[PDB]
Amino acid sequence: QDRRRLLGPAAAKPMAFSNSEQELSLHTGFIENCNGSALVEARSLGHQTSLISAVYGPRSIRGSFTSQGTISIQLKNGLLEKYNTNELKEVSSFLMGIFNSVVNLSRYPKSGIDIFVYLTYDKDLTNSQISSLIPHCITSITLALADAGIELVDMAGAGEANGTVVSFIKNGEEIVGFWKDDGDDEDLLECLDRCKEQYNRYRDLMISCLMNQ
């Protein structure tokens, strides 16, 4: 099959089988390989998620010259739940826009800050699901950047409510990103309030993690 991997025999076919509000866990700086890293685990109802973020930078960019730094974000599929490459790219773009509003790029001329988020373990226990993972990604990237020592304007956090994801800064006064799939009609005000509550809780736990730990 592939000349770079061992994928086994081709006639083989994969095994198909027959028939509080949120619980968080935060850890930072456990990857010596990079500059900043974070572990974010969430458990709620019939879905738990364990994702790992890793920040590599600021490192060299050998092309032209830039007064500010350049951020790149890449999401990788984990072991269990898989997602479309397109969908992972879309979230990556959405995350790039968010942290280009938070990261003090002016302090890193001709430098690159490459942020990796590994969707290691995403279990679906219900015996576009990507929308519920987005706030946890932002939490991991924020923790990793702060752990790396990359300057941030403010602790960026987010929340999710009925397929709507919105990330806040400045005590929830302003918005650094808005995401909406499916959901209902004229439910904007309700989503903003519910997400700001999650944003506030996540921000408190993040600060608590960056300080005490």
Binding site: R3, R4, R5, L6
Partner: protein
């Protein structure tokens, strides 16, 4: 140990050779020292580009391991500090496995080591010393140690071994053991009995190689 080799068979390469042991035939080529790619450049030493091509099909991860082990042998052999920021391309084209490639890569690796060494000699690249490699195997019932085993012997083996030693002083002094690749079930007593008999047959091989090298190269030189 009735191997047969030829030197300087390729025209558009700085050095080449063709080593044959039983059914295992490998042709090797060496170009260097030459201009290296930027990603290959080493500020002080020589950069080695080592390529192994299989007898059947295209190069896979299997040959990637053959390249890696062959690198462990050739690297300390070459006086690399003589060629800073420079490149030496080393290509091995295995022409005939001489073994079940689906199970073993023993004879192909040893033949590649011997051929690469010969190609380096032909190319006139600074070497710290000489080298010889032999394949060894241990049979099931008899548990005898067979040097240079056949393909049929490998099928009924309990362990397979690749031994490559570094020789100096006219091929009499074992400077070091460049590579020992032991795979399968074996005990400590078997290991040293292997190393003792292996060193003997290796020393015999160097002597034979020294003969081949002088027989081919001397007509080129002047008296």
């Amino acid at each position: 140990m009735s191997v047969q080799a030829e030197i300087g068979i390729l025209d558009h390469v700085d050095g080449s050779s063709e080593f044959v042991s039983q059914d295992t035939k490998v042709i090797c080529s060496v170009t260097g020292p030459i201009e290296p790619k930027a990603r290959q450049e080493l500020p002080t030493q020589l950069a080695l580009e080592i390529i192994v091509r299989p007898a059947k099909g295209v190069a896979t991860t299997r040959e990637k391991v053959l390249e890696d082990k062959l690198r462990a042998v050739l690297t300390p052999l070459i006086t690399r500090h003589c060629y800073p920021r420079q490149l030496c391309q080393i290509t091995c084209q295995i022409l005939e496995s001489g073994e079940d490639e689906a199970e073993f890569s023993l004879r192909e690796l040893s033949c590649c080591i011997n051929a690469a060494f010969l190609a380096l000699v032909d190319a006139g690249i600074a070497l710290n010393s000489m080298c010889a490699s032999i394949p060894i195997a241990i049979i099931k019932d008899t548990s005898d140690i067979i040097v240079d085993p056949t393909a049929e012997q490998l099928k009924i083996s309990l362990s397979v071994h690749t031994l490559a030693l570094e020789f100096v002083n006219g091929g009499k002094v074992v400077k070091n053991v460049l590579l020992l690749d032991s795979n399968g079930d074996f005990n400590e007593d078997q290991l040293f009995s292997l190393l003792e008999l292996g060193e003997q047959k290796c020393q015999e091989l160097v002597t034979n190689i020294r003969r081949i090298i002088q027989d081919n190269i001397s007509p080129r030189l002047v008296v």
